Enzyme design. Structure first.
Site, PDB file in Angstrom:
ATOM      1  N   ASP D  40     -16.127   4.371   0.008  1.00 45.88           N
ATOM      2  CA  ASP D  40     -15.516   3.412   0.915  1.00 45.88           C
ATOM      3  C   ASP D  40     -14.031   3.748   1.059  1.00 45.88           C
ATOM      4  OD1 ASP D  40     -14.747   2.587  -1.620  1.00 45.88           O
ATOM      5  OD2 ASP D  40     -15.646   0.603  -1.470  1.00 45.88           O
TER       6      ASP D  40
HETATM    7  C1  LIG Z   1      -0.316  -4.414 -12.333  1.00 40.77           C
HETATM    8  C2  LIG Z   1      -1.699  -4.848 -11.852  1.00 40.77           C
HETATM    9  C3  LIG Z   1      -1.567  -6.056 -10.928  1.00 40.77           C
HETATM   10  C4  LIG Z   1      -2.661  -6.002  -9.867  1.00 40.77           C
HETATM   11  C5  LIG Z   1      -2.682  -7.310  -9.082  1.00 40.77           C
HETATM   12  C6  LIG Z   1      -3.188  -7.059  -7.668  1.00 40.77           C
HETATM   13  C7  LIG Z   1      -4.676  -7.356  -7.580  1.00 40.77           C
HETATM   14  C8  LIG Z   1      -5.032  -7.726  -6.141  1.00 40.77           C
HETATM   15  C9  LIG Z   1      -6.536  -7.934  -6.026  1.00 40.77           C
HETATM   16  C10 LIG Z   1      -6.822  -9.032  -5.011  1.00 40.77           C
HETATM   17  C11 LIG Z   1      -6.728  -8.466  -3.600  1.00 40.77           C
HETATM   18  C12 LIG Z   1      -8.121  -8.462  -2.974  1.00 40.77           C
HETATM   19  O1  LIG Z   1      -9.069  -8.427  -3.672  1.00 40.77           O
HETATM   20  S1  LIG Z   1      -8.341  -8.509  -1.175  1.00 40.77           S
HETATM   21  C13 LIG Z   1     -10.020  -9.081  -0.797  1.00 40.77           C
HETATM   22  C14 LIG Z   1     -10.930  -7.884  -0.539  1.00 40.77           C
HETATM   23  N1  LIG Z   1     -12.178  -8.347   0.036  1.00 40.77           N
HETATM   24  C15 LIG Z   1     -12.275  -8.559   1.463  1.00 40.77           C
HETATM   25  O2  LIG Z   1     -11.341  -8.350   2.153  1.00 40.77           O
HETATM   26  C16 LIG Z   1     -13.581  -9.051   2.088  1.00 40.77           C
HETATM   27  C17 LIG Z   1     -14.244  -7.934   2.889  1.00 40.77           C
HETATM   28  N2  LIG Z   1     -14.653  -6.895   1.969  1.00 40.77           N
HETATM   29  C18 LIG Z   1     -13.866  -5.686   1.815  1.00 40.77           C
HETATM   30  O3  LIG Z   1     -12.860  -5.571   2.441  1.00 40.77           O
HETATM   31  C19 LIG Z   1     -14.297  -4.609   0.820  1.00 40.77           C
HETATM   32  O4  LIG Z   1     -13.164  -3.937   0.350  1.00 40.77           O
HETATM   33  C20 LIG Z   1     -15.268  -3.583   1.412  1.00 40.77           C
HETATM   34  C21 LIG Z   1     -16.619  -4.216   1.728  1.00 40.77           C
HETATM   35  C22 LIG Z   1     -15.477  -2.494   0.355  1.00 40.77           C
HETATM   36  C23 LIG Z   1     -14.686  -2.973   2.684  1.00 40.77           C
HETATM   37  O5  LIG Z   1     -14.978  -1.617   2.768  1.00 40.77           O
HETATM   38  P1  LIG Z   1     -13.710  -0.588   2.945  1.00 40.77           P
HETATM   39  O6  LIG Z   1     -12.853  -0.635   1.707  1.00 40.77           O
HETATM   40  O7  LIG Z   1     -14.249   0.803   3.149  1.00 40.77           O
HETATM   41  O8  LIG Z   1     -12.862  -0.996   4.124  1.00 40.77           O
END
Ligand SMILES: CCCCCCCCCCCC(=O)SCCNC(=O)CCNC(=O)[C@H](O)C(C)(C)COP(=O)(O)O
Ligand SMILES: CCCCCCCCCCCCCCCCCC(=O)OC[C@H](COP(=O)([O-])OCC(O)COP(=O)([O-])OC[C@@H](COC(=O)CCCCCCCCCCCCCCCCC)OC(=O)CCCCCCCCCCCCCCCCC)OC(=O)CCCCCCCCCCCCCCCCC
Ligand SMILES: CCCCCCCCCCCCCCCCCC(=O)OC[C@H](COP(=O)([O-])OCC(O)COP(=O)([O-])OC[C@@H](COC(=O)CCCCCCCCCCCCCCCCC)OC(=O)CCCCCCCCCCCCCCCCC)OC(=O)CCCCCCCCCCCCCCCCC
Ligand SMILES: CCCCCCCCCCCCCCCCCC(=O)O[C@@H](COC(=O)CCCCCCCCCCCCCCC)COP(=O)(O)OCC[N+](C)(C)C
Ligand SMILES: CCCCCCCCCCCCCCCCCC(=O)O[C@@H](COC(=O)CCCCCCCCCCCCCCC)COP(=O)(O)OCC[N+](C)(C)C
Ligand SMILES: CCCCCCCCCCCCCCCCCC(=O)O[C@@H](COC(=O)CCCCCCCCCCCCCCC)COP(=O)(O)OC[C@H](O)CO
Ligand SMILES: CCCCCCCCCCCCCCCCCCCC(=O)O[C@H](COC(=O)CCCCCCCCCCCCCC)COP(=O)(O)OCCN
Ligand SMILES: CCCCCCCCCCCCCCCCCCCC(=O)O[C@H](COC(=O)CCCCCCCCCCCCCC)COP(=O)(O)OCCN
Ligand SMILES: CCCCCCCCCCCCCCCCCC(=O)OC[C@H](COP(=O)(O)O)OC(=O)CCCCCCCCCCCCCCCCC
Lengths: 37, 443, 253, 84, 62, 157, 83, 387
Positions: D40
């Site tokens: 991905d």
């Molecule tokens: C020092 C350490 C500190 C870290 C803190 C930071 C952590 C931040 C984590 C929170 C941010 C999020 O999760 S953001 C939320 C992410 N989830 C969504 O947006 C819903 C839609 N699903 C997607 O986007 C998926 O990634 C996918 C299906 C694989 C799309 O495939 P691709 O990818 O090919 O595009």
């Protein structure tokens, strides 16, 4: 067949004219490359 | 003196003419050189030939710059005033007119000066003018300009401390008191030999001439060949022989061998040349070697014969440069391989070329014949073999002269058309002078 | 519509704007800037009194702008080469962009003469070029060095005239090749001739002359009557900027 | 062409080899990140960051977003004038 | 686009053209003062701060 | 002579991709016979990228440090390292580049654009601080929005 | 006619690049060492003005023959990691 | 009685009034100070005695002040002039040291202050190097003065320690091989300070040498070093600032040949012609007159540089200084090549001279056109004039 003079003298340059004017460079030699070398 | 100031100020007014009046600029610059020819002819009228050696004297106080007329200076001044309007007919810009006007002022004042420091100041003030004339940007050669300027500067820088040495020794640089005082003649003699052996092309300090006299324009070549080489001869006759005569006797084997090898080696080099202007340019070195040996012989009438050879060369070699300049102007090359059959296509130009070829080879009814006979009389009276060397090598001059003429004039007719009225009248005063000075030169 | 007041002009906003129909004498400058775009010119330039040079214009050497000619550098830059002549009432303009993708400035080389009533816009003219009269050279076109354009010729946009030739017509076609003497001397001759004429005009000019005496007489008469207004222009520009800043601040919050 | 097309290729394979979600023998010199290798967007970003770590560069978001293949990455590194 | 461009151009040209002689002369004096102030070694730069558009003293720097 | 094509500017156009020192790719169009440094100047690059050609009689020519790929190494013009032009290039490498030099380092005035350069990608190389006179220098930092094209003259004095 | 440039363009340009891949030193060290050499040891030539001229001329030619030129100077020691 | 010292009290009172006037003018926000410059020129005239050399320095500094615009620069130039004037009257090493150190500090501060644009750090760098190199030469002067003071018990400048004081003087003239501080200064510092540095301190120091200095040694090796190094360096350096720095080293070698053979009349004539040429060189806006400087610095005959070189050559040949003279003639033959390079660059080129836009239209055409008339001075130079 150029016309570089009026009937009463008066040289004309013929800058925009089609016919090639006879001038100073008319008899300049065609350079042979090996002779020049 | 007042006349000379008026002539200079009239000549300098060419710059103030607005450039949009083309006819007026041409006429003014041509008349500005015509007038000194009339004045020098009048000076010849005024000369008393049964009077003193120095006539029409003027001295400008404590500034050096003292002037006087003798026969050699008068003949050379007449030749220069003839040659400068022909140069005016071969130029097209105000920059060219002004460079040649300044050159005429400097040459005319240098020919008749009687002060050694004045001669130094007046002559090599023309160096930067020669640099700009030879190294002009689209069609000149900067290498040639660098060579002529650096050789002349080297010789002049050798002379300058010896000039100042005799000036501290006796108190003056005036030639009339320098010739009557006791001076260290070896040092000053070496300084004077250093300048005048570069001005006259004498081997080994002669390599500037083949580059400069070819890279120059036609007017520059006429001036450089017919005039500026003879300043070395008049340097010998006016300054070095009267002031350091003991040196002039003691250096005679060295000057003699320099003249002999210059004559022979320059004649041998002229045969292998493939450029018409380089052919004309080399031939001047052998003539100046004969001039120098005739001056240094000091034997029968040496000043007379050597001055007469200087005049004969100054008439004949500018005309050859003029004919080569016509060919280059209307065919854009100076290369022998591009020219053939010029007799059929330029009959008048080829006839003039043949006559001046015969004149350059010292054939009779030309002033070079009388000149070379009298120069060899002056050389013969010291020893017969020094004359024999020049006598037996006459086949070598005729070889290159007739070979160049026969290669460019006969054969298949190719090349430009015959001369115009303007080109014919550039040539014509030299031809009339040659016919007169070769048939009835004296009365 | 666009307002005719500029508060970010380099010398500030205009305190007093004069309507053109209220002018009783002609006040047209020949060389003037447009906001921050100032013309550049040498000490020996000839600018005719009824010619207009405005905006971002660079002039070099012995160039000349003859009677009624316009060089308007408001959309891009214009450069006039050394000893290049712009003759009577020719127009030089420039676009903001050209179809070729190159720089859209009008660049004119040295020793270039432009005959009367010709128009140059966002074109490239190389050195030693004669543009004929009533000729148009369009946006992005290129005229190469040592070439001649016949009078009443059109060079369409993004077209090229090859070097060493004479071209003419609408659209421009090949006429003939220039001779070697024409390339060597004649183009420089035409440029030098027009420079000499410009020098003749430059010698006789009395600048600023005496036409100001009448206008000063009228102003003296106004001071006599007590109707001449003295305006502190620097302070008025300052106060207008302060009011503009206050008006801008009193609307965002 | 700022660098050769062989050593960069084996360096690309060398850094592609140490990925836990990739197959160490399925990796080919001309493949795809999406259909072939099954990655991905975040896996692609991680691989591009590994390539940046190995070659000492900086690849912006749009340029790394355009990279979708091993050949695309090799061509981008070869076309880069600041490669190591 | 051409019509809109010439509207925008006619605005700037009308702004430059319709200035009086007194405003133009004041602006030339301002241009002169600004070029004199472009020297960073000018002795007033350590005390006074100058307005960019009129070359008047706006405030004390120190 | 016949119905053959009218000459267009598009026949003589050369396109070069240029990567500046920030890594930003640029599309640079030039004409055949124009040098690369001139096309870089006319594109609108800042004046901190350019420096004088340090030869005698050529300091009025502006020049830039470019990185050229190995395919286009043989289309840079030849300079004799024993001649005076070679000593000019040696002075430029000695004084301006110094330890930013790579095996792809050339100078942009020695590249004459032709059809063989069409599609070539080059990059701008970094340079050390330098001075010619008081009115033309470089302090070492590329923080200036002034274009080289907007300078009316290139002054040797 | 124009003469051909001798050699190959890649080889010539590598010759032009050689020995310049190094940061240039400031000139303060050369100037300070020159001033120290003159102010400390130029008094050694005071009696040399009275020596015979053949010795002085041969010494001047010897200094010219052993002089190393500051411009375009390079050492192999600049790019080696051990003596 | 202090009635013989009114010019000193006038100097101090004038400085006290000028600082207060400059303060009052700056409290009004005046962006130009031509009134301050006129008062400075009046003060320069009012403190200078009635000798030829003193008034030559005074008139030179009055002309130089027209190229400086800030109040602080004018103050630094006045306090450098005090050192330059009073060094010509110094009869000890105390006043010699103080005058030289005042001049060095003023030059360093002016080099720091007047730089602008991208060349600011280069000028500050070259000023720092000059200050460091000047400090150790000043230490050498103090150390050997202390040695002389201990040996003789007095303030007489006699004995073996005068050789090091002579080396101090040769450093201050940029004599090769201690020449590289001036070569560093020429490449970065602006043209007005370069004009100041090539004229006034050389005049001041040579007048001190003419007035109150004797040594039992020679300077011939430094003549050879200066002439050969300057000529070859100016032949080899393509930047014009370095060309003129090396040609200056060659000229100071010629002036040292004039000093070494005695005969200070030729020294003074050549120095005056050189100073007028410098005044033309650094104020040029039309580049065609750059060729007149070239033909008059190459020693070409009708112009005044020929006369200045040629009396040096004449007096050297008079006392038979043959080897140094031969070296001088060889270096004169070499100098012509790069002066011809100058002529090629700026005479055989199309003419472009930009007009002024913010007023001050070609503001130093008077001085440059007046100094170009060094083609009319040769009528007076040929006479017994400078003696
Ligand atoms: C020092 C350490 C500190 C870290 C803190 C930071 C952590 C931040 C984590 C929170 C941010 C999020 O999760 S953001 C939320 C992410 N989830 C969504 O947006 C819903 C839609 N699903 C997607 O986007 C998926 O990634 C996918 C299906 C694989 C799309 O495939 P691709 O990818 O090919 O595009
Ligand atoms: C102790 C502490 C240690 C400190 C050491 C300090 C060193 C720092 C480095 C340095 O100085 O930088 C170099 C520095 C370089 O100078 P620069 O300012 O950067 O540049 C100036 C030039 O551009 C120079 O440019 P360049 O260096 O880049 O080279 C360009 C080259 C370019 O050269 C050319 O192109 C010109 C060449 C012309 C002819 C070419 C030959 C062609 C011939 C044709 C072939 C035929 C065969 C002939 C064979 C040969 C015959 C000639 O020029 C030369 O090579 C010529 C320069 C030589 C100067 C000579 C002047 C000396 C006195 C004059 C008399 C002798 C001269 C010889 C004549 C006499 C002969 C009889 O040199 C100096 O400053 C000179 C001083 C250094 C020498 C002495 C050092 C002092 C230390 C003393 C040691 C201890 C005390 C003992 C002595 C007592 C006190 C004196
Ligand atoms: C008690 C002592 C009184 C004061 C004496 C020393 C102060 C001299 C300063 C001075 O003359 O100020 C120039 C000043 C002119 O400056 P400006 O017109 O405001 O500036 C216009 C621009 O400089 C553009 O105009 P410009 O560059 O054409 O003119 C600059 C200025 C001076 O320009 C120059 O510096 C070049 C003149 C070269 C001649 C040098 C003479 C030295 C000859 C040595 C002979 C022994 O022009 C003059 O020649 C004015 C001379 C007036 C009489 C001088 C006495 O002359 C006067 O206003 C008169 C001053 C005379 C006494 C009051
Ligand atoms: C050293 C003596 C000078 C001789 C130089 C050679 C002259 C070349 C031509 C020979 C002509 C001989 C003329 C003799 C009679 C003329 C007057 C005369 O006597 O000559 C004058 C000077 O003669 C001349 O000036 C002759 C001028 C010749 C120059 C001719 C070339 C210029 C003309 C070019 C062509 C023009 C054509 C124009 C037509 C279209 C003085 O010489 P001497 O008699 O030796 O002086 C006597 C010495 N003393 C006073 C001490 C007793
Ligand atoms: C021009 C103003 C500055 C002149 C200063 C000259 C100083 C010395 C420079 C080297 C010597 C050059 C002398 C050449 C004289 C002949 C010449 O060519 O004159 C000139 C003008 O020369 C003069 O100044 C003549 C007047 C001075 C001499 C006569 C009066 C005093 C005796 C003619 O005009 P152009 O060459 O077309 O001028 C264009 C300029 N440029 C080359 C830069 C493209
Ligand atoms: C710096 C100025 C420029 C360079 C110096 C120029 C010096 C002036 C030229 C040479 C002056 C002497 C001319 C030769 C001569 O014999 O003159 C006498 C004869 O006068 C003439 O007929 C002079 C003719 C002048 C022209 C002939 C050529 C000589 C030099 C030419 C200079 C001008 C050339 C212009 C070219 C365009 C002197 O007449 P006078 O009455 O003054 O002397 C008599 C008595 O002693 C009282 O003093
Ligand atoms: C018109 C010029 C352009 C305008 C610009 C002006 C420039 C500023 C002013 C000129 C600056 C240059 C001057 C340099 C100094 C030369 C004068 C030094 C003094 C000198 O030569 O010695 C005195 C001779 O004076 C003399 O008479 C020396 C003659 C002149 C020498 C200068 C030659 C070049 C002109 C003799 O002194 P003394 O025997 O009376 O001393 C005994 C008591 N201690
Ligand atoms: C260098 C410039 C001149 C160029 C050519 C030099 C050729 C060598 C000189 C030949 C002179 C003849 C000669 O040998 O006589 C000498 C006469 O002494 C002398 O009087 C020697 C004077 C020779 C040099 C004069 C040239 C100075 C020109 C200007 C130079 C620049 C200023 C001065 C440095 C000593 O005879 P011997 O020892 O062979 O006799 C053997 C029995 N005892
Ligand atoms: C063409 C060149 C013109 C130069 C003018 C030279 C005038 C020399 C006058 C000297 C004099 O009379 O002494 C006055 C005077 C000495 O006589 P006192 O008045 O008795 O003290 O000293 C001066 O004021 C000297 C003036 C020097 C001017 C600068 C040097 C030349 C430039």
């Amino acid at each position: 067949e150029a016309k570089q003079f009026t009937p009463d003298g008066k040289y004309m340059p013929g800058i925009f004219s089609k016919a090639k004017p006879l001038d100073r460079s008319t008899q300049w030699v065609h350079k042979n490359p090996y002779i020049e070398a | 003196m007042f006349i000379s100031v008026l002539l200079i100020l009239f000549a300098l007014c060419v710059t103030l003419i607005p450039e949009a009046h083309y006819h007026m600029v041409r006429v003014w610059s041509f008349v500005a050189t015509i007038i000194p020819m009339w004045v020098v002819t009048w000076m010849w009228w005024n000369f008393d030939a049964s009077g003193h050696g120095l006539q029409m004297l003027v001295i400008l106080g404590r500034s050096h710059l003292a002037f006087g007329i003798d026969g050699v200076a008068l003949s050379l001044m007449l030749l220069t005033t003839v040659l400068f309007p022909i140069c005016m007919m071969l130029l097209r810009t105000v920059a060219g007119f002004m460079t040649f006007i300044l050159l005429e002022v400097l040459v005319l004042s240098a020919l008749c000066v009687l002060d050694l420091l004045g001669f130094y100041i007046l002559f090599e003030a023309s160096l930067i003018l020669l640099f700009l004339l030879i190294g002009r940007a689209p069609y000149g050669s900067l290498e040639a300009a660098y060579k002529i300027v650096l050789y002349t500067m080297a010789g002049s820088l050798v002379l300058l401390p010896t000039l100042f040495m005799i000036y501290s020794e006796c108190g003056t640089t005036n030639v009339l008191y320098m010739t009557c005082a006791y001076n260290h003649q070896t040092v000053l003699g070496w300084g004077l030999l250093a300048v005048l052996a570069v001005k006259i092309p004498l081997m080994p300090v002669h390599l500037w001439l083949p580059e400069a006299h070819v890279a120059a324009p036609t007017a520059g070549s006429v001036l450089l060949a017919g005039v500026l080489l003879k300043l070395g001869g008049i340097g010998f006759l006016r300054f070095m022989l009267p002031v350091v005569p003991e040196f002039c006797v003691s250096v005679f084997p060295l000057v003699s061998t320099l003249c002999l090898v210059s004559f022979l080696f320059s004649t041998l080099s002229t045969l292998r040349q493939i450029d018409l202007k380089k052919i004309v340019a080399y031939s001047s070195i052998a003539h100046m070697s004969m001039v120098t040996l005739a001056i240094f012989s000091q034997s029968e009438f040496s000043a007379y014969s050597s001055s007469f050879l200087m005049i004969a060369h100054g008439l004949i070699s500018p005309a050859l440069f003029l004919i080569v300049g016509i060919l280059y102007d209307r065919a854009h090359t100076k290369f022998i391989l591009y020219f053939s059959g010029l007799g059929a296509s330029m009959p008048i130009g080829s006839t003039l070329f043949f006559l001046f070829t015969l004149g350059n080879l010292a054939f009779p009814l030309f002033p070079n014949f009388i000149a070379e006979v009298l120069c060899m009389v002056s050389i013969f009276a010291v020893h017969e073999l020094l004359a024999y060397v020049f006598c037996v090598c006459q086949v070598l001059g005729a070889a290159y002269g007739f070979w160049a003429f026969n290669r460019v004039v006969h054969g298949l007719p190719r090349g430009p058309a015959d001369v115009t009225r303007t080109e014919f009248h550039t040539v014509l005063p030299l031809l009339i002078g040659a016919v007169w000075l070769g048939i009835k030169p004296m009365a | 519509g666009v307002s005719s007041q500029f508060f970010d002009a380099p010398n500030g906003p205009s305190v007093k704007q004069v309507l053109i129909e209220d002018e009783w004498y002609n006040r047209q400058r020949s060389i003037f800037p447009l906001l921050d775009k100032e013309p550049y010119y040498p000490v020996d330039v000839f600018v005719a009194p009824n010619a207009v040079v405005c905006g971002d214009v660079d002039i070099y050497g012995g160039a000349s702008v003859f009677f009624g000619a316009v060089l308007r550098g408001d959309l891009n830059k214009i450069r006039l080469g050394n000893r290049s002549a712009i003759l009577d009432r020719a127009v030089v303009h420039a676009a903001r962009a050209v179809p070729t993708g190159l720089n859209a400035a009008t660049l004119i080389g040295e020793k270039v003469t432009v005959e009367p009533y010709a128009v140059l816009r966002s074109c490239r003219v190389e050195p030693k070029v004669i543009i004929g009269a009533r000729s148009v050279v369009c946006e992005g076109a290129v005229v190469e060095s040592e070439s001649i354009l016949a009078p009443n010729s059109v060079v369409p946009p993004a077209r090229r005239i090859p070097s060493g030739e004479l071209w003419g017509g609408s659209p421009a076609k090949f006429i003939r090749k220039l001779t070697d003497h024409e390339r060597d001397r004649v183009l420089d001759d035409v440029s030098t001739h027009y420079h000499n004429l410009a020098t003749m005009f430059r010698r006789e000019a009395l600048e600023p002359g005496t036409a100001w005496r009448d206008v000063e007489a009228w102003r003296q008469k106004l001071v006599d009557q007590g109707e001449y207004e003295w305006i502190n222009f620097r302070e008025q520009k300052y106060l207008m900027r302060l009011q503009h800043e206050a008006e801008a601040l009193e609307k965002l919050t | 062409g700022f660098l050769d097309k062989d050593s960069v290729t084996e360096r690309v394979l060398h850094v592609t080899k140490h990925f836990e979600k990739i197959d160490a023998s399925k990796v080919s010199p001309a493949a795809s990140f999406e259909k072939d290798l099954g990655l991905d967007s975040l896996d692609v970003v991680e691989l591009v960051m590994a390539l940046e770590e190995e070659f000492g560069l900086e690849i912006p978001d749009a340029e790394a977003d355009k990279i979708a293949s091993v050949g695309d990455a090799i061509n981008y590194i070869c076309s880069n004038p600041m490669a190591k | 686009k051409s019509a809109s461009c010439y509207a925008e151009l006619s605005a700037i040209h009308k702004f430059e053209q319709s200035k009086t002689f007194e405003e133009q002369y004041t602006e030339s004096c301002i241009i002169k003062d600004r070029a004199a102030l472009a020297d960073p070694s000018n002795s007033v730069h350590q005390m006074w701060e100058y307005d960019s558009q009129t070359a008047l003293v706006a405030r004390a720097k120190r | 002579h016949g119905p053959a094509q009218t000459p267009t500017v598009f026949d003589k156009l050369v396109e070069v991709t240029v990567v500046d020192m920030n890594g930003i790719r640029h599309r640079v169009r030039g004409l055949q016979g124009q040098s690369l440094a001139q096309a870089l100047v006319e594109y609108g690059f800042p004046d901190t990228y350019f420096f004088p050609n340090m030869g005698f009689y050529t300091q009025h020519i502006v020049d830039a440090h470019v990185f050229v790929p190995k395919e286009f190494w043989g289309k840079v013009q030849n300079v004799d390292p024993e001649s005076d032009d070679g000593l000019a290039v040696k002075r430029m490498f000695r004084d301006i580049v110094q330890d930013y030099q790579r095996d792809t380092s050339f100078f942009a005035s020695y590249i004459t654009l032709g059809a063989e350069h069409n599609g070539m990608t080059v990059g701008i190389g970094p340079i050390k601080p330098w001075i010619l006179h008081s009115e033309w220098a470089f302090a070492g930092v590329h923080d200036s929005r002034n274009k080289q094209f907007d300078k009316p003259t290139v002054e040797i004095w | 006619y124009k003469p051909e440039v001798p050699g190959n363009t890649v080889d010539n340009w590598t010759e032009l690049r050689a020995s310049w891949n190094k940061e240039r030193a400031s000139s303060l060290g050369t100037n300070y060492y020159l001033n120290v050499a003159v102010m400390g040891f130029a008094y050694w030539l005071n009696e040399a003005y009275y020596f015979p001229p053949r010795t002085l001329y041969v010494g001047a030619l010897v200094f010219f023959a052993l002089y190393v030129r500051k411009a375009y100077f390079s050492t192999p020691y600049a790019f080696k990691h051990e003596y | 009685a202090a009635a013989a010292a009114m010019i000193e009290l006038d100097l101090c009172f004038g400085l006290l009034l000028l600082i207060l006037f400059g303060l009052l003018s700056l409290r009004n926000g005046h962006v130009s100070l031509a009134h301050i410059r006129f008062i400075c020129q009046c003060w320069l005239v009012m403190i200078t005695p009635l000798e030829v050399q003193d008034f030559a320095l005074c008139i030179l500094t009055v002309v130089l002040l027209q190229s400086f615009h800030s109040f602080e620069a004018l103050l630094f130039l006045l306090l450098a002039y005090i050192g330059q004037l009073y060094m010509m009257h110094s009869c000890n090493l105390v006043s010699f040291y103080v005058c030289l150190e005042a001049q060095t500090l003023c030059v360093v501060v002016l080099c720091g202050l007047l730089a602008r644009g991208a060349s600011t750090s280069f000028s500050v760098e070259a000023a720092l190097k000059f200050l460091l190199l000047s400090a150790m030469v000043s230490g050498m002067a103090l150390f050997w003065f202390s040695a002389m003071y201990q040996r003789t018990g007095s303030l007489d400048m006699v004995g073996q320690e005068t050789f090091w004081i002579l080396l101090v003087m040769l450093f201050k003239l940029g004599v090769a091989p201690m020449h590289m501080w001036s070569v560093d200064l020429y490449g970065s510092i602006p043209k007005s300070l370069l004009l100041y540095l090539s004229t006034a301190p050389k005049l001041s120091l040579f007048t001190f040498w003419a007035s109150s200095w004797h040594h039992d040694f020679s300077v011939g090796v430094f003549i050879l070093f200066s002439m050969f190094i300057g000529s070859i360096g100016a032949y080899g350096q393509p930047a014009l600032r370095s060309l003129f720095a090396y040609s200056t080293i060659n000229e100071i070698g010629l002036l040292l040949l004039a000093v070494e053979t005695a005969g200070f009349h030729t020294l003074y004539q050549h120095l005056g012609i050189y100073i007028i040429t410098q005044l033309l060189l650094w104020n040029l806006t039309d580049k065609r007159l750059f060729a007149l400087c070239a033909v008059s610095l190459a020693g070409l005959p009708p112009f005044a540089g020929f006369f200045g070189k040629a009396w040096i050559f004449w007096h050297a040949m008079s006392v038979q200084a043959f080897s140094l003279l031969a070296a001088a003639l060889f270096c004169t033959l070499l100098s012509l090549v790069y002066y011809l390079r100058v002529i090629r660059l700026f005479w055989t080129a199309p003419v472009h001279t930009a007009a002024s836009f913010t007023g001050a239209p070609n503001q130093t055409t008077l001085t440059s056109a007046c100094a170009v008339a060094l083609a009319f001075a040769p009528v007076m130079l040929v006479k017994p004039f400078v003696i």
